[PDB]
Structure 1
Amino acid sequence: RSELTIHPKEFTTFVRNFNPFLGATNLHTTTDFIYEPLVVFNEMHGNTPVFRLAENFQMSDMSVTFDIRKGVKWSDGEAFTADDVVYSFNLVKEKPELDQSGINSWVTGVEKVNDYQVKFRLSEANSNVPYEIAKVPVVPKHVWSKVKDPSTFTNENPVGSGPFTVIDTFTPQLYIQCENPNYWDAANLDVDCLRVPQIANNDQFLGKVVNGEMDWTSSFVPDIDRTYAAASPKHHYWYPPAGTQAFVVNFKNPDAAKNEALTNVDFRRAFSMALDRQTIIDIAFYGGGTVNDFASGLGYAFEAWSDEKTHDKFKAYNSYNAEGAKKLLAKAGFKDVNKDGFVDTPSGKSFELLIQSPNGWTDFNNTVQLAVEQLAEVGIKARARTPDFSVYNQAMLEGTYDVAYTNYAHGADPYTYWNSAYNSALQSGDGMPRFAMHFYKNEKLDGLLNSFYKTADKQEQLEIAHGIQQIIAQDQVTIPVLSGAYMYQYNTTRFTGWWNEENPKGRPNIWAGIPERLLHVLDLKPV
């Protein structure tokens, strides 16, 4: 049998948990591979919908119905039907802790129309809602209804719809997830098993990938041409452009001195001008990125959406200018009053910014250490922390952090970045990710975001985008640094069929949250 070695997520030890709603504690081979979506939107190719368990869908406006593919079975053998979909969406509406997106804010309810067809009722006008709906995991009703506790259910013997449901081998350091015996698309599948080794950080990953022990990965790799590519003719990669990375500052820091600094727009702009974004790219990412000098975080890949007058107005604040940063600090009134060379707050208080990035994410760790040095050059005191991801994440959810370095989801239009990074509704909820947790709130901004897909008028949507750009830019809510890359390494020793620059069928990454990985694995063939 052919075994495909993949690495979606760092772990110190595997805990057997295949619960699709528990994104913070499950294994990252659950979505897509155990639970196939209704539709995969191919985001690299204009969000072209690729139909899987649903064969079609139809909007109307307010209304949308999905037709279900008939003759699909679960891995046990039972039939896949429309009440599985209905069952699944009810669950999350009642337990909004399993809402990892904000889906409950859009869908008011769901109704079975027949054995292969389901209607979805909306809260507001949203031409983008089929994309949102595809995010919700569909689980089997003949199992999860018999389940007493979904919020804690670990689901160690999963019944799934996807290509790999069979747990063949499981240890704290290795598991192997094999083909669903009843898989509906089996004629299309040429890989027998997914092989998933425990790897805790980038250092551990590097030794393994360079030794040719991996097949499909998406980790940071330093000096990739000399370390990884040069080791074997079988060692390849392809890094299509990805999303924004930024320093995010906590507007609700509990320390008086740090709050005084972080909530000050002159201070955020001077922080931003202290940074040398191209040096960060050159050193921390070995060239693997593009400068992002948009105060709104938009990035150069959306030139067509950008209001260039706005971009030009605030670009000086997002360009390397150490002398300008020192002048702005002086003008704002951050004066050093205790002879240590670091500026103090207007109220006379000293402070040091603690900047966090996740443990093991060494490209971001190095970025933070570079920024620390650069900030010290303009008299801003900071130092780095590299906490375990869950600690890092919890600090942002609870608002106990000072500054955090983070990437963001990247979509075919600016909404994916702008909504996830700035919609204040995403700052409360216990299924919420880190991305909006600066705790800046602007009601006009939320309104513009909530209207982005409200009309089917392209010109108006463009005007809404320009308004969102204006607001974020003038308030320098975050400090955008660069636009990153979809890191992706593949090995042709054991498999062929890979997406790459000459075969760019979609986002090639193995991360959970990249639905296209289902379509990718269906293209792979054993050598």
Structure 2
Amino acid sequence: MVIVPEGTQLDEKQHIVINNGAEPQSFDPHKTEGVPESNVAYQLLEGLVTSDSEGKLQPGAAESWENTPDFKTWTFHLRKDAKWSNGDPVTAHDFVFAWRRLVDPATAAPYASYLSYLQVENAQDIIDGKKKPAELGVEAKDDYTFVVHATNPVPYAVSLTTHQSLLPLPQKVVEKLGDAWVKKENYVGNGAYKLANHIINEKIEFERNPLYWNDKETVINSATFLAIENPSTDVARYRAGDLDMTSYGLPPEQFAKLKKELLGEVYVTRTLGTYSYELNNKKAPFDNVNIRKALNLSLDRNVITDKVLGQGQTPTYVFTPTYIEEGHLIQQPAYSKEPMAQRNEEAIKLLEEAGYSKANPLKFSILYNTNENHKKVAIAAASMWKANTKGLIDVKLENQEWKTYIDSRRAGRYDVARAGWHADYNQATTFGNYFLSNSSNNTAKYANPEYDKAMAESYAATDAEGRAKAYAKAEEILGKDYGIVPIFNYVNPRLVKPYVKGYSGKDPQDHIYLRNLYIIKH
């Protein structure tokens, strides 16, 4: 109804097929940290606030909310008639239950730190085993009023609440079934869809959740998510007419021709994302700053963005995208403005000083998730690091399936890993928070108490300028330590069939909510 322009002739079936790119780790939002996982979670569950086709915030499970003028108390007014898919009522108790479970050490959640980022009273103490989960600073004031108590001002709090990690869970179900609640037979959610089927490595089928509070505005009746790893295979299925929307990678070598032949089907979203090679800071020899610096100097970003990809990705030398809100004072480092000849000279010296030569080069593997585009970037990186250092680096490639790749990065079983970080919310700390010493997201094992202190100063600021200065200083410190190898800021290219509507190409987080889409007839 409302999302559909008047007069628009809708197709009768309303089925859509989307490539989700990989088999998700889990459908439990406390056990996951990836885009494939969040894409599934967002169809089955809905948090306090959610977003439209352009990423603008809109009421979710909460119909209204407010904050105290100090930005420390956040009150959410929940819908009195909203239900779980089994008929249970959705209440503030479910949010209290879910947010406690997220920080509870027993959950071992990859995103435990998220409530620490939000500065929720006692979140960090709970993660650290010093306080019980019941001591977390959130409460059901009554069944339909959920209150969040932050120890520091967090003016961007509402945007943080759209993240998968803060989705509610059906307390009554999870308390009874444990971790097994996530099985298809048991899953209960408050989102627009429910799980109709799941075949590992093949497909996830979604069906309408008729008990969704806003089911009357949902148009798509059913959807399939595929798990096609390689952009070229994604495009081949699309052109065979067997899927309707690709994942957010397209083959660089096909890109020009696809724009020519598929007019109005090629979308490119400019997103708040950074593609990096993460260095394992606690594994020899990347514990050596001199070697981390050599790798940064000797990698020519323009080769990757202009010659390997060429889809609008832009080179970067910092973790935070500088165009994110409050990111504007972050500076690209000085070396980024030196000619490659100078950079390569400096890198070779550093590597010789560290005992490498053509006969005894620095050897390591780039770990990446199986994907032909990542392979291309890794080959170009391998090739550049060898030639630019005159044979002093010799790089192997190792691809793993998504789930294995995530496990390997979290377990520290890597030298150098391909890493993409997409904003959890449209403000700088979604990047800055990543490299805090104690962040559950910090798989790099980067730890500088001076980085942590610079970030901490942001909460003492009283305005966006004060915050932006603190974030600039944090990034400067991360830059001087060469903690990682930033490569580019993302663009998200997709093919979308012309009968698919409600995909904007303008959402800086490029979410796809099935409830935002519709299939037209003509």
Length-normalised TM-score, structure 2: 0.82
Partners of 1:442 and 1:398 lie apart in 2 by: 20
Partner of 1:100: 111
Q: Secondary structure at the match of 2:212?
A: coil
Q: Secondary structure at the match of 1:238?
A: strand
Partner of 1:164: 193
Q: Secondary structure at the match of 2:43?
A: coil
Partners of 2:161 and 2:422 lie apart in 1 by: 17
Question: Is the CA contact 1:18–1:155 (under 8 Å) kept in the aligned structure 2?
Answer: no
Partners of 1:43 and 1:128 lie apart in 2 by: 20
Q: Which amino acid aligns with 1:111?
A: E
Partner of 1:4: 16
**Sequence identity (%):** 18
Q: Which amino acid aligns with 2:89?
A: A
Offset of residue 419 of structure 1: 1.6
Q: Does 1:524 align with 2:504?
A: no
Partners of 1:303 and 1:78 lie apart in 2 by: 39
Offset of residue 97 of structure 1: 1.4
Q: Which amino acid aligns with 2:218?
A: L
Partner of 1:65: 75
Question: Is the CA contact 1:179–1:193 (under 8 Å) kept in the aligned structure 2?
Answer: yes
User: CA-to-partner distance for each residue in 1:282-336, whole Å, 9 max, x for gaps?
Assistant: 33313331111x3x3344535974447x53xx33257561453234432674377
Q: Does 1:285 align with 2:309?
A: yes
User: CA-to-partner distance for each residue in 1:135-190, whole Å, 9 max, x for gaps?
Assistant: 3121223322322x2278535342221111151x4444334211112222123211
Offset of residue 57 of structure 1: 1.7
Question: Is the CA contact 1:140–1:160 (under 8 Å) kept in the aligned structure 2?
Answer: yes
Partner of 1:38: 48
Offset of residue 491 of structure 1: 0.7
User: CA-to-partner distance for each residue in 1:320-353, whole Å, 9 max, x for gaps?
Assistant: 614532344326743777xx625x5xxxxx5312
User: CA-to-partner distance for each residue in 1:422-457, whole Å, 9 max, x for gaps?
Assistant: 11112xxxxx44xx2222211121122234345432
Q: Which amino acid aligns with 1:154?
A: K
Alignment equivalent of 2:501, drawn from 491, 496, 504: 496
Partners of 2:31 and 2:184 lie apart in 1 by: 11
Q: Does 1:91 align with 2:115?
A: no
Partners of 1:454 and 1:162 lie apart in 2 by: 37
Partner of 1:487: 493
Are the structure 2 counterparts of residues 124 and 238 from structure 1 closer, same or farther at C-alpha, using a change threshold of 3 Å? same
Partners of 2:92 and 2:346 lie apart in 1 by: 64
Alignment of 1:160-239 (within 5 A): 160-165=189-194, 167=196, 169-172=197-200, 173-222=202-251, 223-226=253-256, 228-233=258-263, 235-239=265-269
Are the structure 2 counterparts of residues 480 and 24 from structure 1 closer, same or farther at C-alpha, using a change threshold of 3 Å? closer
User: CA-to-partner distance for each residue in 1:80-124, whole Å, 9 max, x for gaps?
Assistant: 222222232233343341362513433323222122112223344
Alignment of 1:438-477 (within 5 A): 438-477=444-483
Q: Which runs of 5+ in 2 are unaligned?
A: 1-12, 121-135
Partners of 2:33 and 2:367 lie apart in 1 by: 19
Offset of residue 237 of structure 1: 2.0
Alignment equivalent of 1:321, drawn from 337, 340, 348: 340
Q: Does 1:416 align with 2:452?
A: no
Moved over 6 A (4+): 42-45
Are the structure 2 counterparts of residues 456 and 56 from structure 1 closer, same or farther at C-alpha, using a change threshold of 3 Å? farther
User: CA-to-partner distance for each residue in 1:178-203, whole Å, 9 max, x for gaps?
Assistant: 11122221232111111223424334
Partners of 2:143 and 2:230 lie apart in 1 by: 46
Partners of 1:397 and 1:473 lie apart in 2 by: 22
Partners of 1:400 and 1:190 lie apart in 2 by: 44
Offset of residue 5 of structure 1: 0.6
Question: Is the CA contact 1:210–1:228 (under 8 Å) kept in the aligned structure 2?
Answer: no
Partners of 1:230 and 1:110 lie apart in 2 by: 53
Alignment of 1:375-386 (within 5 A): 375-377=385-387, 378-379=389-390, 380-383=392-395, 384-386=397-399
Partners of 1:327 and 1:89 lie apart in 2 by: 48
Partners of 1:52 and 1:249 lie apart in 2 by: 38
Alignment equivalent of 1:154, drawn from 183, 187, 192: 183
Q: Does 1:297 align with 2:319?
A: yes
Partners of 1:481 and 1:499 lie apart in 2 by: 26
Length-normalised TM-score, structure 1: 0.81
Are the structure 2 counterparts of residues 453 and 492 from structure 1 closer, same or farther at C-alpha, using a change threshold of 3 Å? farther
Question: Is the CA contact 1:165–1:179 (under 8 Å) kept in the aligned structure 2?
Answer: yes
User: CA-to-partner distance for each residue in 1:213-263, whole Å, 9 max, x for gaps?
Assistant: 22223231113445544554573323324422222211211xxxx42xx23
Alignment equivalent of 1:245, drawn from 268, 275, 278: 275
Partners of 2:48 and 2:467 lie apart in 1 by: 27
Are the structure 2 counterparts of residues 439 and 320 from structure 1 closer, same or farther at C-alpha, using a change threshold of 3 Å? farther
Length, aligned pairs only: 480
Partners of 1:53 and 1:487 lie apart in 2 by: 31
Are the structure 2 counterparts of residues 96 and 453 from structure 1 closer, same or farther at C-alpha, using a change threshold of 3 Å? farther
Partners of 2:49 and 2:185 lie apart in 1 by: 26
Partners of 2:205 and 2:433 lie apart in 1 by: 37
RMSD: 3.1
Q: Which runs of 5+ in 1 are unaligned?
A: 345-349, 427-431
Q: Does 1:269 align with 2:269?
A: no
Alignment equivalent of 2:63, drawn from 32, 52, 55: 55
Q: Which amino acid aligns with 2:138?
A: V
Question: Is the CA contact 1:499–1:508 (under 8 Å) kept in the aligned structure 2?
Answer: no
Partners of 2:27 and 2:404 lie apart in 1 by: 22
26-35 or 156-165, larger mean C-alpha shift? 26-35
